[PDB]
Design a protein around this ligand. Structure first.
Ligand SMILES: Cc1cc2nc3c(=O)[nH]c(=O)nc-3n(C[C@H](O)[C@H](O)[C@H](O)COP(=O)(O)O)c2cc1C
Ligand SMILES: Cc1cc2nc3c(=O)[nH]c(=O)nc-3n(C[C@H](O)[C@H](O)[C@H](O)COP(=O)(O)O)c2cc1C
Ligand SMILES: Cc1cc2nc3c(=O)[nH]c(=O)nc-3n(C[C@H](O)[C@H](O)[C@H](O)COP(=O)(O)O)c2cc1C
Ligand SMILES: Cc1cc2nc3c(=O)[nH]c(=O)nc-3n(C[C@H](O)[C@H](O)[C@H](O)COP(=O)(O)O)c2cc1C
Ligand SMILES: Cc1cc2nc3c(=O)[nH]c(=O)nc-3n(C[C@H](O)[C@H](O)[C@H](O)COP(=O)(O)O)c2cc1C
Ligand SMILES: Cc1cc2nc3c(=O)[nH]c(=O)nc-3n(C[C@H](O)[C@H](O)[C@H](O)COP(=O)(O)O)c2cc1C
Ligand SMILES: Cc1cc2nc3c(=O)[nH]c(=O)nc-3n(C[C@H](O)[C@H](O)[C@H](O)COP(=O)(O)O)c2cc1C
Ligand SMILES: Cc1cc2nc3c(=O)[nH]c(=O)nc-3n(C[C@H](O)[C@H](O)[C@H](O)COP(=O)(O)O)c2cc1C
Lengths: 187, 187, 187, 187
């Protein structure tokens, strides 16, 4: 059984990004032998999050869940041509090579199609510094497009991205450290 | 009189990044007709910061100060090959073209020299989405180097960067909107 | 008198990018005391360019012209979510801190609005490694938009970008080395 | 049998980058059922390369070989904080989603450790615009380090990167289009 964790980083209530992540999570679970959690970073304790205070039980649980995941869905709205500070604050408290062995699917929504590359240029290098095993294609959606109530061509791309994410999940213990630069120094 | 604002984003106490920003701020003030403030993002109210709650007076004051600055010193440690979530959380609550008319100096410290480009590839595009007028060269310092108790060649580069920052400050009202894509839609 | 040099990097004949650069060059020259050249990288000798062979007179002249410019207009179509290899091949043969003291205006055309950030994330850091003094806002145009036969809002942004470029040009000998990390090691 | 293609992009003779790519290619071939080619972009016809002239037989063969590869080793020296124009010129003539279904290993050498992130921030997004299936961790080496005559810790990282590359190769026809946004529009 794969353990899939979704992490969404909008600081606003009624997040369309969160709906996108939830959609992706349900899609993967309907087609694989998986369990899931959805970490809404906005629902973590702000003081504990910014201070990396792992005596906060809910924050510690979120971190542990991410560390135990076989795949991560990482979703953010685009703020100022990049990922949210809220999402990055969460990534900052994971251990150094937290993503070793893991697959990942980067998702975003934005107000403008001008900022599609924020995922590939901004978020992707961050995940690769955490030793991630396999980050599949990014998917970005413009605000308006969404309502699976979305345009056909857009829906095909999203579904293909989520399919690829699911196909890239690994059971095998041999892959657990892949992505780490020095796999015998743990992972 | 120029108004200079420094913003430092380490979430850790006893921040060397903060010492770097303070050094840069003092350097500029000793050589120009300027006033300064140093916003330590860690000292802002975490809940209010993450929620963009401007009824918090100290947060509102920080935002206003940034909006009134002629120059910004933006300093962060490198976390996960990029700027901190803490710093980005602060940038996220500034208005859309908050940096129109302004000069900026990007500063960072990091544990490894491998991540020098995090400023130019990560932070610089963020400032440019906020309509910044003039971002001078980045300066990055490796942890060890610091203690102006720092290596000669390193010190020359830092000082040149801060000099350039100071020389790039503008008094003229005509430059107030430069950097904004549509300067008559305010700034 | 300012010396302005435009560099356009499409490898295709009938380049709309070239027309954009020529437009920007004429705009600056009509409003400042300036001379101009337009280097079409496609018109340089391919063997000499790829080998950095400065015994080719036309290639050497192009390099010298760039080194003597007060401002550079650097224009490229977007290929594979970045600047062209053709343009980069030219930038690769300039000396290490070739752009010290200079202003620069990054321009691009692309088939899709999805790749606007290729300038800020891809080209801007390259110019900053060459010690550039002042790179103003990027301007990107989608293929269709062009024909000053272009949409009003788009035209305003382009013109504002070119205005800012012109305003940022410096006469003063004191600015000649600004941008260089060690200005007394020449520039 | 996997078909592995190495592409090295230094424009200088006696390229250490080429030696790195050749080393990686031999490493993969010694541990998997594979054939290999090494495309030295410098050895392609400069005029034909810059013009994308596929009536040049050697250029056409290189492009076809890349399109038929199950894995690509893409190696470049760092020039001006990014990949070479020479390498990018070659990538520019591949079809739009040329890398669909493929694994890739990004390699670089550079004079300074300051530019490690040029791979993750610069090259990685380019490959992802070509629909690549799986790009494993980057490896960067500083000039001095090289002579497998290299430092132990450095050698471990390189070998782990190449191991991961080899493990990520896919035989299965089902993976042939993975990475493409619309896999039924070919690949
Ligand atoms: C403070 C702020 C900054 C934003 N910056 C951008 C931006 O740089 N680019 C963009 O395409 N949209 C930007 N947006 C629009 C959001 O990305 C868009 O509304 C997104 O879908 C919000 O998703 P959410 O409901 O999950 O919060 C911004 C929105 C806010 C509130
Ligand atoms: C490339 C790199 C990545 C690092 N990543 C992490 C990390 O993810 N988590 C972490 O706690 N420390 C990380 N560190 C280092 C230590 O956290 C940090 O250097 C140490 O706590 C010393 O801090 P100080 O000497 O400035 O007080 C990293 C260091 C380097 C060089
Ligand atoms: C959670 C964490 C992640 C880090 N990631 C990096 C990194 O990706 N690259 C790096 O050179 N240093 C990394 N470091 C090291 C810090 O950048 C370095 O210690 C910095 O000087 C801390 O500055 P400060 O005292 O202001 O907090 C990390 C440190 C921590 C605690
Ligand atoms: C490129 C871009 C940048 C933006 N930047 C900001 C911003 O800095 N601050 C902001 O409040 N809104 C920004 N917005 C947009 C609005 O904040 C946001 O679209 C609006 O609140 C609608 O959100 P919703 O429709 O998803 O609820 C930006 C939009 C775009 C397209
Ligand atoms: C080989 C090739 C690759 C291209 N890649 C992109 C791309 O990644 N993104 C984009 O928006 N347009 C891409 N385009 C479209 C061009 O950017 C667009 O047509 C541009 O305006 C051409 O400008 P030019 O006439 O000066 O050559 C590509 C075109 C070609 C021929
Ligand atoms: C950050 C950095 C930038 C450099 N930029 C240039 C450059 O622009 N032009 C140049 O000729 N050499 C540049 N060099 C270095 C030399 O060109 C190069 O190291 C030297 O020719 C030695 O090559 P080899 O030892 O691999 O043969 C740079 C080195 C570093 C570390
Ligand atoms: C024109 C030129 C520009 C260079 N720019 C950089 C640079 O920005 N950063 C860096 O670490 N090294 C730079 N170097 C150094 C090369 O990356 C280094 O020498 C590399 O190992 C050369 O590899 P090669 O033998 O395959 O050609 C540059 C070298 C040259 C000749
Ligand atoms: C994102 C994107 C990527 C593209 N990539 C390629 C490509 O790799 N190769 C290519 O030949 N054309 C690519 N194109 C488009 C066509 O090559 C190009 O638009 C067409 O030849 C029209 O050029 P023109 O209308 O400026 O003359 C791309 C377009 C877009 C929007």
């Amino acid at each position: 059984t794969y353990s899939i964790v979704a992490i969404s980083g909008s600081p606003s209530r009624n997040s369309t990004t969160a709906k996108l992540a939830e959609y992706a999570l349900a899609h993967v679970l309907a087609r694989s032998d998986s369990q899931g959690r959805h970490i809404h970073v906005i629902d973590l304790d702000p003081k504990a999050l910014l201070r990396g205070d792992l005596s906060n039980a809910k924050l510690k649980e979120a971190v542990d869940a991410t560390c135990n995941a076989d795949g991560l869905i990482v979703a953010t709205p685009i703020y100022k041509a990049s990922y949210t500070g809220l999402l990055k604050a969460f990534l900052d408290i994971l251990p150094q090579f937290a993503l070793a062995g893991k697959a990942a699917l980067p998702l975003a929504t934005g107000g403008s199609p001008a900022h599609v590359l924020a995922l590939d240029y901004g978020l992707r290098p961050v995940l690769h510094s955490m030793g991630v095993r396999h980050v599949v294609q990014s998917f970005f959606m413009v605000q308006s497009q969404f309502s699976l109530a979305v345009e056909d061509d857009v829906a095909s791309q999203l579904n293909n991205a989520i399919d690829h994410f699911r196909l890239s999940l690994s059971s095998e213990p041999s892959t657990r450290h892949l992505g780490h630069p020095r796999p015998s120094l743990d992972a």
